[PDB]
Amino acid sequence: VSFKAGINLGGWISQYQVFSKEHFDTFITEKDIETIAEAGFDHVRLPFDYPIIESDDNVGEYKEDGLSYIDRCLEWCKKYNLGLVLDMHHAPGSTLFEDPNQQKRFVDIWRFLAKRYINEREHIAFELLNEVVEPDSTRWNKLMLECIKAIREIDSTMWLYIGGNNYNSPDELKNLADIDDDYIVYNFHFYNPFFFTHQKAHWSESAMAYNRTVKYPGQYEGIEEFVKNNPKYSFMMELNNLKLNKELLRKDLKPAIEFREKKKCKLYCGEFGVIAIADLESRIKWHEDYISLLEEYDIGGAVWNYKKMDFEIYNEDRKPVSQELVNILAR
């Protein structure tokens, strides 16, 4: 069981449109894990949102019906020799770093999960929290240290994936508190250049305003003309005529590499990808360049996303959007 070439299962028990059993039971099935396993991936990252495990009305009572989804996924992975990175996407409250109570629930959910899977030693790793956007890392470091401690009381050797501030930015790793612990893997997400990977992203106001098709390798066009029309996105002027190429990707990856040089730790890129509406040749090339960098620096990771979520690698018929793309991603 290795955690090097994975794929995310976003939209299943996280970022689900509607909380419906029909969805939860149909979105991901053993046939999907089989498909992923067959394609050559070695693990899947599974983001989950709290409510499918804990309801705000009766805090502390965990849902077996919700848990059955994680349990069954674990069973499917074991059968196909895949690893599973259980990832908490949305946590209690964001008020989490404000409200002591939301923090208590956060650590208790992890304490509960550590016990629940205490006998699974090689197929599961825990990834604490994705959603982190703070002015600085002081409060996340406090909560994170408390969370590691609680988990360690129960399981001294479970692998814990920890990311930094600003959505696990690679330049925020240096701001995390020192964790003298041998079973930690440091996580970072990578979506650079943002306007290429999220070109026309409906959810990005800035991307939706700019509204431009971007090729890779290539460059940002009409930035100056766009800012002129939209003074509100003046900050974008810094990107005027930016050249998008492999050297740009290596530059953006440098902060994670430096951090590792100092901490002598393991790194993991839990999310990276290109919006599916981008031209295929560019979409393939970006992944190819990025994966070559991950391979060069020996960094494992998981591409966003398996199906749907606008970053699909596979269609609903469980067939890859491109075989070359999957081959690249399976390393």
mmCIF file of C-alpha atoms in Angstrom:
data_model
loop_
_atom_site.group_PDB
_atom_site.id
_atom_site.type_symbol
_atom_site.label_atom_id
_atom_site.label_comp_id
_atom_site.label_asym_id
_atom_site.label_seq_id
_atom_site.Cartn_x
_atom_site.Cartn_y
_atom_site.Cartn_z
ATOM 1 C CA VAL A 1 0.000 0.000 0.000
ATOM 2 C CA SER A 2 1.573 3.267 -1.151
ATOM 3 C CA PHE A 3 0.228 6.804 -1.214
ATOM 4 C CA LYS A 4 1.977 8.173 -4.322
ATOM 5 C CA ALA A 5 -0.369 8.282 -7.345
ATOM 6 C CA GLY A 6 -3.926 8.901 -6.213
ATOM 7 C CA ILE A 7 -7.206 10.460 -7.210
ATOM 8 C CA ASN A 8 -9.877 12.298 -5.217
ATOM 9 C CA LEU A 9 -13.505 11.232 -4.737
ATOM 10 C CA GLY A 10 -14.908 14.707 -4.256
ATOM 11 C CA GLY A 11 -18.650 15.212 -4.472
ATOM 12 C CA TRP A 12 -19.499 11.894 -2.771
ATOM 13 C CA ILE A 13 -19.764 12.574 0.964
ATOM 14 C CA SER A 14 -18.360 16.070 0.598
ATOM 15 C CA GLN A 15 -19.655 18.950 -1.544
ATOM 16 C CA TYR A 16 -22.702 16.827 -2.305
ATOM 17 C CA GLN A 17 -25.527 18.908 -3.820
ATOM 18 C CA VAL A 18 -28.257 17.461 -1.621
ATOM 19 C CA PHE A 19 -27.894 15.219 1.427
ATOM 20 C CA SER A 20 -29.661 12.174 -0.043
ATOM 21 C CA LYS A 21 -29.149 8.443 0.557
ATOM 22 C CA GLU A 22 -29.715 7.853 -3.166
ATOM 23 C CA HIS A 23 -26.679 10.005 -3.936
ATOM 24 C CA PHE A 24 -24.545 8.588 -1.093
ATOM 25 C CA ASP A 25 -25.340 5.061 -2.271
ATOM 26 C CA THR A 26 -24.947 5.636 -6.014
ATOM 27 C CA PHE A 27 -22.171 8.213 -6.629
ATOM 28 C CA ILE A 28 -19.331 5.900 -5.628
ATOM 29 C CA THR A 29 -19.675 2.116 -5.717
ATOM 30 C CA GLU A 30 -17.175 -0.721 -5.636
ATOM 31 C CA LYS A 31 -17.073 -0.620 -9.422
ATOM 32 C CA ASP A 32 -15.439 2.833 -9.200
ATOM 33 C CA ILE A 33 -12.701 1.686 -6.802
ATOM 34 C CA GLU A 34 -12.190 -1.257 -9.074
ATOM 35 C CA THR A 35 -11.878 1.104 -12.069
ATOM 36 C CA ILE A 36 -9.400 3.305 -10.207
ATOM 37 C CA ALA A 37 -7.454 0.255 -9.011
ATOM 38 C CA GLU A 38 -7.400 -1.116 -12.550
ATOM 39 C CA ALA A 39 -6.150 2.191 -13.951
ATOM 40 C CA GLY A 40 -3.065 1.905 -11.739
ATOM 41 C CA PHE A 41 -3.729 4.471 -9.010
ATOM 42 C CA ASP A 42 -2.449 3.361 -5.607
ATOM 43 C CA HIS A 43 -4.843 5.242 -3.334
ATOM 44 C CA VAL A 44 -7.843 7.507 -3.201
ATOM 45 C CA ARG A 45 -8.338 10.645 -1.114
ATOM 46 C CA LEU A 46 -11.804 10.822 0.347
ATOM 47 C CA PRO A 47 -13.012 14.218 1.529
ATOM 48 C CA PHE A 48 -15.965 14.224 3.902
ATOM 49 C CA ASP A 49 -17.970 17.030 5.482
ATOM 50 C CA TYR A 50 -18.900 16.735 9.148
ATOM 51 C CA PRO A 51 -22.725 16.656 8.895
ATOM 52 C CA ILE A 52 -22.775 13.164 7.442
ATOM 53 C CA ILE A 53 -21.189 12.052 10.735
ATOM 54 C CA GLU A 54 -22.395 14.600 13.273
ATOM 55 C CA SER A 55 -25.479 16.798 13.332
ATOM 56 C CA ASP A 56 -25.381 20.177 15.012
ATOM 57 C CA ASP A 57 -28.583 19.477 16.945
ATOM 58 C CA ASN A 58 -27.208 16.467 18.832
ATOM 59 C CA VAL A 59 -23.471 16.915 19.037
ATOM 60 C CA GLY A 60 -21.395 13.931 20.116
ATOM 61 C CA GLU A 61 -23.737 11.283 18.704
ATOM 62 C CA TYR A 62 -22.091 9.917 15.572
ATOM 63 C CA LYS A 63 -24.139 8.635 12.624
ATOM 64 C CA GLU A 64 -23.585 4.973 11.756
ATOM 65 C CA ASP A 65 -25.405 5.491 8.495
ATOM 66 C CA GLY A 66 -22.876 8.184 7.572
ATOM 67 C CA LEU A 67 -19.945 6.149 8.838
ATOM 68 C CA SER A 68 -21.029 3.166 6.742
ATOM 69 C CA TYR A 69 -19.888 5.097 3.671
ATOM 70 C CA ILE A 70 -16.349 5.481 5.000
ATOM 71 C CA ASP A 71 -16.405 1.869 6.270
ATOM 72 C CA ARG A 72 -17.481 0.473 2.924
ATOM 73 C CA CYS A 73 -14.941 2.614 1.041
ATOM 74 C CA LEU A 74 -12.260 1.225 3.346
ATOM 75 C CA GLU A 75 -13.487 -2.281 2.563
ATOM 76 C CA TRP A 76 -13.341 -1.670 -1.206
ATOM 77 C CA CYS A 77 -9.815 -0.226 -1.000
ATOM 78 C CA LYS A 78 -8.540 -3.209 1.039
ATOM 79 C CA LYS A 79 -9.932 -5.543 -1.619
ATOM 80 C CA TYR A 80 -8.062 -3.729 -4.381
ATOM 81 C CA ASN A 81 -4.919 -2.958 -2.386
ATOM 82 C CA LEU A 82 -5.529 0.760 -2.423
ATOM 83 C CA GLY A 83 -4.691 3.233 0.320
ATOM 84 C CA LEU A 84 -7.293 5.657 1.621
ATOM 85 C CA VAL A 85 -6.611 9.207 2.867
ATOM 86 C CA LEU A 86 -9.653 10.153 4.895
ATOM 87 C CA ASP A 87 -9.912 13.885 4.583
ATOM 88 C CA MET A 88 -12.029 16.253 6.665
ATOM 89 C CA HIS A 89 -13.199 18.930 4.233
ATOM 90 C CA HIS A 90 -15.606 21.122 6.197
ATOM 91 C CA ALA A 91 -15.285 21.117 9.986
ATOM 92 C CA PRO A 92 -17.721 22.199 12.739
ATOM 93 C CA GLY A 93 -18.259 25.888 12.054
ATOM 94 C CA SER A 94 -16.254 29.848 9.697
ATOM 95 C CA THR A 95 -16.425 30.158 13.494
ATOM 96 C CA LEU A 96 -14.192 27.165 14.311
ATOM 97 C CA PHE A 97 -11.209 29.234 15.419
ATOM 98 C CA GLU A 98 -13.476 31.585 17.321
ATOM 99 C CA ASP A 99 -15.742 29.153 19.171
ATOM 100 C CA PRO A 100 -14.102 26.800 21.728
ATOM 101 C CA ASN A 101 -17.067 24.485 21.336
ATOM 102 C CA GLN A 102 -16.613 23.922 17.610
ATOM 103 C CA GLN A 103 -12.989 23.035 18.352
ATOM 104 C CA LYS A 104 -13.997 20.434 20.956
ATOM 105 C CA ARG A 105 -16.257 18.768 18.393
ATOM 106 C CA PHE A 106 -13.395 18.810 15.829
ATOM 107 C CA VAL A 107 -11.008 16.903 18.080
ATOM 108 C CA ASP A 108 -13.706 14.528 19.308
ATOM 109 C CA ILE A 109 -14.614 13.520 15.742
ATOM 110 C CA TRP A 110 -10.972 12.661 15.133
ATOM 111 C CA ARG A 111 -10.699 10.849 18.492
ATOM 112 C CA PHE A 112 -13.745 8.828 17.530
ATOM 113 C CA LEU A 113 -12.327 7.961 14.097
ATOM 114 C CA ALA A 114 -8.894 6.989 15.417
ATOM 115 C CA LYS A 115 -10.564 4.410 17.664
ATOM 116 C CA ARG A 116 -13.012 3.260 15.014
ATOM 117 C CA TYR A 117 -10.239 2.330 12.639
ATOM 118 C CA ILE A 118 -7.524 1.439 15.163
ATOM 119 C CA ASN A 119 -7.089 -2.052 13.717
ATOM 120 C CA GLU A 120 -6.536 -0.916 10.129
ATOM 121 C CA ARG A 121 -2.816 -0.288 10.094
ATOM 122 C CA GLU A 122 -1.781 0.019 6.461
ATOM 123 C CA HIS A 123 -4.714 1.129 4.331
ATOM 124 C CA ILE A 124 -5.742 4.370 5.998
ATOM 125 C CA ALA A 125 -4.235 7.769 6.747
ATOM 126 C CA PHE A 126 -6.029 10.721 8.338
ATOM 127 C CA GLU A 127 -5.911 14.260 6.830
ATOM 128 C CA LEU A 128 -7.043 16.698 9.519
ATOM 129 C CA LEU A 129 -8.477 19.773 7.842
ATOM 130 C CA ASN A 130 -8.651 21.302 4.359
ATOM 131 C CA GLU A 131 -10.642 24.437 5.125
ATOM 132 C CA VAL A 132 -8.076 26.830 6.613
ATOM 133 C CA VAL A 133 -8.061 30.531 5.759
ATOM 134 C CA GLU A 134 -6.794 32.697 8.615
ATOM 135 C CA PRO A 135 -4.894 36.051 8.924
ATOM 136 C CA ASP A 136 -2.062 33.971 10.357
ATOM 137 C CA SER A 137 -1.377 30.426 11.571
ATOM 138 C CA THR A 138 -1.477 30.987 15.351
ATOM 139 C CA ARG A 139 -4.961 29.610 15.910
ATOM 140 C CA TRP A 140 -4.734 26.691 13.440
ATOM 141 C CA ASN A 141 -1.443 25.678 15.031
ATOM 142 C CA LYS A 142 -3.062 25.564 18.475
ATOM 143 C CA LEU A 143 -5.991 23.438 17.364
ATOM 144 C CA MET A 144 -3.789 21.238 15.205
ATOM 145 C CA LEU A 145 -1.396 20.508 18.066
ATOM 146 C CA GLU A 146 -4.341 19.620 20.359
ATOM 147 C CA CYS A 147 -5.726 17.373 17.658
ATOM 148 C CA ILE A 148 -2.447 15.523 17.074
ATOM 149 C CA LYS A 149 -2.127 14.981 20.851
ATOM 150 C CA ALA A 150 -5.657 13.572 21.198
ATOM 151 C CA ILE A 151 -5.093 11.195 18.302
ATOM 152 C CA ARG A 152 -1.670 10.128 19.581
ATOM 153 C CA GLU A 153 -3.222 9.170 22.930
ATOM 154 C CA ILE A 154 -5.195 6.550 21.047
ATOM 155 C CA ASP A 155 -2.945 5.639 18.089
ATOM 156 C CA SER A 156 0.764 6.388 18.226
ATOM 157 C CA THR A 157 1.530 5.425 14.688
ATOM 158 C CA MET A 158 -1.401 6.423 12.451
ATOM 159 C CA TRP A 159 -0.143 8.641 9.605
ATOM 160 C CA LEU A 160 -1.502 12.180 9.847
ATOM 161 C CA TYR A 161 -1.582 14.527 6.819
ATOM 162 C CA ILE A 162 -1.258 18.157 7.925
ATOM 163 C CA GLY A 163 -1.626 21.227 5.717
ATOM 164 C CA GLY A 164 -1.095 24.923 6.351
ATOM 165 C CA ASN A 165 -2.990 28.226 6.220
ATOM 166 C CA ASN A 166 -4.773 29.637 3.136
ATOM 167 C CA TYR A 167 -6.151 26.353 1.784
ATOM 168 C CA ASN A 168 -2.927 24.366 2.351
ATOM 169 C CA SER A 169 -0.836 26.775 0.319
ATOM 170 C CA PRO A 170 2.687 25.513 -0.308
ATOM 171 C CA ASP A 171 4.108 28.778 1.030
ATOM 172 C CA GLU A 172 2.266 28.384 4.324
ATOM 173 C CA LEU A 173 3.974 25.158 5.408
ATOM 174 C CA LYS A 174 6.790 27.209 6.908
ATOM 175 C CA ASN A 175 4.237 28.768 9.256
ATOM 176 C CA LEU A 176 3.062 25.528 10.878
ATOM 177 C CA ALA A 177 4.163 24.707 14.455
ATOM 178 C CA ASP A 178 6.928 22.167 14.905
ATOM 179 C CA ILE A 179 5.557 18.670 15.332
ATOM 180 C CA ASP A 180 8.197 16.329 16.729
ATOM 181 C CA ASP A 181 6.446 13.273 15.412
ATOM 182 C CA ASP A 182 7.552 10.616 12.950
ATOM 183 C CA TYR A 183 4.167 9.854 11.397
ATOM 184 C CA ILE A 184 3.303 13.136 9.731
ATOM 185 C CA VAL A 185 3.055 13.974 6.051
ATOM 186 C CA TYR A 186 2.793 17.643 5.053
ATOM 187 C CA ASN A 187 0.108 18.516 2.542
ATOM 188 C CA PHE A 188 -0.278 21.351 0.036
ATOM 189 C CA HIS A 189 -2.720 21.990 -2.808
ATOM 190 C CA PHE A 190 -1.537 23.210 -6.235
ATOM 191 C CA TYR A 191 -3.713 25.020 -8.758
ATOM 192 C CA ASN A 192 -1.180 27.429 -10.305
ATOM 193 C CA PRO A 193 -1.608 29.340 -12.630
ATOM 194 C CA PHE A 194 -5.042 29.964 -11.165
ATOM 195 C CA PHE A 195 -6.569 31.553 -14.272
ATOM 196 C CA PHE A 196 -5.500 28.653 -16.391
ATOM 197 C CA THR A 197 -6.582 25.849 -13.964
ATOM 198 C CA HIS A 198 -9.855 27.673 -13.083
ATOM 199 C CA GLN A 199 -10.511 29.486 -16.319
ATOM 200 C CA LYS A 200 -14.201 30.371 -16.399
ATOM 201 C CA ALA A 201 -14.821 28.753 -12.998
ATOM 202 C CA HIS A 202 -18.442 29.607 -12.203
ATOM 203 C CA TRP A 203 -17.579 29.831 -8.514
ATOM 204 C CA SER A 204 -14.681 32.258 -8.955
ATOM 205 C CA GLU A 205 -15.856 35.849 -9.215
ATOM 206 C CA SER A 206 -12.479 36.932 -10.555
ATOM 207 C CA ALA A 207 -12.339 34.005 -13.047
ATOM 208 C CA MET A 208 -15.960 34.556 -14.070
ATOM 209 C CA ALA A 209 -15.309 38.314 -14.573
ATOM 210 C CA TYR A 210 -12.095 37.759 -16.575
ATOM 211 C CA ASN A 211 -13.913 35.017 -18.498
ATOM 212 C CA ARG A 212 -11.110 33.929 -20.832
ATOM 213 C CA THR A 213 -9.945 30.718 -22.378
ATOM 214 C CA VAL A 214 -6.265 30.208 -21.551
ATOM 215 C CA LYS A 215 -3.819 27.804 -23.166
ATOM 216 C CA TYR A 216 -0.852 26.146 -21.512
ATOM 217 C CA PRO A 217 1.995 26.576 -22.268
ATOM 218 C CA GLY A 218 1.136 30.127 -23.274
ATOM 219 C CA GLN A 219 0.268 33.404 -21.587
ATOM 220 C CA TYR A 220 -2.466 35.505 -20.056
ATOM 221 C CA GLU A 221 -4.051 37.780 -22.650
ATOM 222 C CA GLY A 222 -5.995 40.989 -22.358
ATOM 223 C CA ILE A 223 -5.188 41.463 -18.697
ATOM 224 C CA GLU A 224 -4.591 45.212 -19.168
ATOM 225 C CA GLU A 225 -7.755 45.615 -21.217
ATOM 226 C CA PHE A 226 -9.739 43.668 -18.606
ATOM 227 C CA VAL A 227 -8.485 45.746 -15.619
ATOM 228 C CA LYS A 228 -9.264 48.931 -17.573
ATOM 229 C CA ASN A 229 -12.851 47.725 -17.820
ATOM 230 C CA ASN A 230 -12.857 46.334 -14.280
ATOM 231 C CA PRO A 231 -10.954 48.589 -11.824
ATOM 232 C CA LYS A 232 -12.207 46.331 -9.024
ATOM 233 C CA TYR A 233 -9.784 43.569 -10.107
ATOM 234 C CA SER A 234 -6.795 45.935 -10.432
ATOM 235 C CA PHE A 235 -4.653 43.449 -8.484
ATOM 236 C CA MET A 236 -4.702 41.295 -11.615
ATOM 237 C CA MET A 237 -2.436 43.810 -13.345
ATOM 238 C CA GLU A 238 0.473 41.919 -11.759
ATOM 239 C CA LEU A 239 -0.384 38.994 -14.037
ATOM 240 C CA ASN A 240 -0.334 41.062 -17.213
ATOM 241 C CA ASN A 241 1.278 39.015 -19.982
ATOM 242 C CA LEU A 242 2.419 36.266 -17.574
ATOM 243 C CA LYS A 243 4.104 33.347 -19.397
ATOM 244 C CA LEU A 244 2.619 30.011 -18.401
ATOM 245 C CA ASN A 245 5.157 27.212 -18.632
ATOM 246 C CA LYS A 246 6.953 24.477 -16.632
ATOM 247 C CA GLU A 247 9.417 26.912 -15.122
ATOM 248 C CA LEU A 248 6.485 28.869 -13.732
ATOM 249 C CA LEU A 249 5.177 25.648 -12.098
ATOM 250 C CA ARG A 250 8.601 24.791 -10.645
ATOM 251 C CA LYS A 251 8.830 28.319 -9.233
ATOM 252 C CA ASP A 252 5.444 28.032 -7.491
ATOM 253 C CA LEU A 253 6.463 24.620 -6.090
ATOM 254 C CA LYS A 254 9.732 25.955 -4.603
ATOM 255 C CA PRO A 255 8.323 26.930 -1.182
ATOM 256 C CA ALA A 256 7.317 23.294 -0.458
ATOM 257 C CA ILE A 257 10.737 22.045 -1.558
ATOM 258 C CA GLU A 258 12.571 24.549 0.703
ATOM 259 C CA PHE A 259 10.370 23.578 3.641
ATOM 260 C CA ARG A 260 11.222 19.945 3.079
ATOM 261 C CA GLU A 261 14.904 20.807 2.779
ATOM 262 C CA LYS A 262 14.755 22.169 6.318
ATOM 263 C CA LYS A 263 12.271 19.773 8.000
ATOM 264 C CA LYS A 264 13.504 16.656 6.133
ATOM 265 C CA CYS A 265 9.844 15.555 6.026
ATOM 266 C CA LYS A 266 7.426 13.857 3.604
ATOM 267 C CA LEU A 267 5.334 16.042 1.322
ATOM 268 C CA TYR A 268 2.025 15.293 -0.328
ATOM 269 C CA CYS A 269 0.026 17.308 -2.877
ATOM 270 C CA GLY A 270 -3.531 16.361 -1.991
ATOM 271 C CA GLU A 271 -5.276 18.364 -4.710
ATOM 272 C CA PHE A 272 -4.109 19.627 -8.126
ATOM 273 C CA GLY A 273 -5.961 19.773 -11.428
ATOM 274 C CA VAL A 274 -7.333 21.697 -14.402
ATOM 275 C CA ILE A 275 -10.979 22.581 -15.049
ATOM 276 C CA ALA A 276 -12.509 20.172 -17.591
ATOM 277 C CA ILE A 277 -13.689 22.859 -20.010
ATOM 278 C CA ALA A 278 -10.057 23.856 -20.713
ATOM 279 C CA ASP A 279 -8.774 22.652 -24.074
ATOM 280 C CA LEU A 280 -7.684 19.026 -23.915
ATOM 281 C CA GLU A 281 -4.173 19.539 -25.236
ATOM 282 C CA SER A 282 -3.477 22.161 -22.535
ATOM 283 C CA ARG A 283 -5.217 20.160 -19.811
ATOM 284 C CA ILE A 284 -3.040 17.147 -20.589
ATOM 285 C CA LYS A 285 0.187 19.156 -20.852
ATOM 286 C CA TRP A 286 -0.256 20.932 -17.510
ATOM 287 C CA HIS A 287 -0.789 17.588 -15.709
ATOM 288 C CA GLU A 288 2.169 16.071 -17.537
ATOM 289 C CA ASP A 289 4.490 18.966 -16.569
ATOM 290 C CA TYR A 290 3.205 19.018 -13.019
ATOM 291 C CA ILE A 291 3.454 15.237 -12.503
ATOM 292 C CA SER A 292 7.013 15.334 -13.895
ATOM 293 C CA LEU A 293 7.874 17.865 -11.198
ATOM 294 C CA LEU A 294 6.221 15.725 -8.489
ATOM 295 C CA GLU A 295 8.130 12.708 -9.759
ATOM 296 C CA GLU A 296 11.384 14.732 -9.886
ATOM 297 C CA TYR A 297 11.051 15.808 -6.267
ATOM 298 C CA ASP A 298 9.531 12.513 -5.176
ATOM 299 C CA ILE A 299 6.221 13.966 -3.957
ATOM 300 C CA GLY A 300 3.065 11.823 -3.904
ATOM 301 C CA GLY A 301 -0.344 13.318 -4.550
ATOM 302 C CA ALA A 302 -3.929 12.984 -5.624
ATOM 303 C CA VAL A 303 -5.459 14.619 -8.686
ATOM 304 C CA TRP A 304 -8.745 16.508 -8.387
ATOM 305 C CA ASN A 305 -11.173 14.960 -9.338
ATOM 306 C CA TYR A 306 -12.404 11.425 -10.174
ATOM 307 C CA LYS A 307 -15.817 12.384 -11.639
ATOM 308 C CA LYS A 308 -17.992 15.514 -11.790
ATOM 309 C CA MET A 309 -16.985 18.556 -9.746
ATOM 310 C CA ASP A 310 -16.027 20.235 -13.090
ATOM 311 C CA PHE A 311 -12.514 18.761 -12.896
ATOM 312 C CA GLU A 312 -13.499 15.247 -14.031
ATOM 313 C CA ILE A 313 -10.943 12.703 -15.116
ATOM 314 C CA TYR A 314 -13.617 10.033 -15.824
ATOM 315 C CA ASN A 315 -17.113 10.260 -17.370
ATOM 316 C CA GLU A 316 -20.084 8.739 -15.551
ATOM 317 C CA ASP A 317 -19.752 5.539 -17.549
ATOM 318 C CA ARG A 318 -16.453 5.107 -15.646
ATOM 319 C CA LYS A 319 -14.429 5.670 -18.814
ATOM 320 C CA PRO A 320 -11.514 8.112 -18.761
ATOM 321 C CA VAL A 321 -11.904 11.464 -20.450
ATOM 322 C CA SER A 322 -8.481 10.647 -21.932
ATOM 323 C CA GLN A 323 -6.339 7.528 -21.617
ATOM 324 C CA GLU A 324 -3.142 9.523 -21.977
ATOM 325 C CA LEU A 325 -4.242 11.734 -19.073
ATOM 326 C CA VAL A 326 -5.006 8.731 -16.818
ATOM 327 C CA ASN A 327 -1.705 7.025 -17.771
ATOM 328 C CA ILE A 328 0.136 10.173 -16.813
ATOM 329 C CA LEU A 329 -1.747 10.503 -13.519
ATOM 330 C CA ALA A 330 -1.194 6.852 -12.543
ATOM 331 C CA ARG A 331 2.538 7.569 -12.764
#
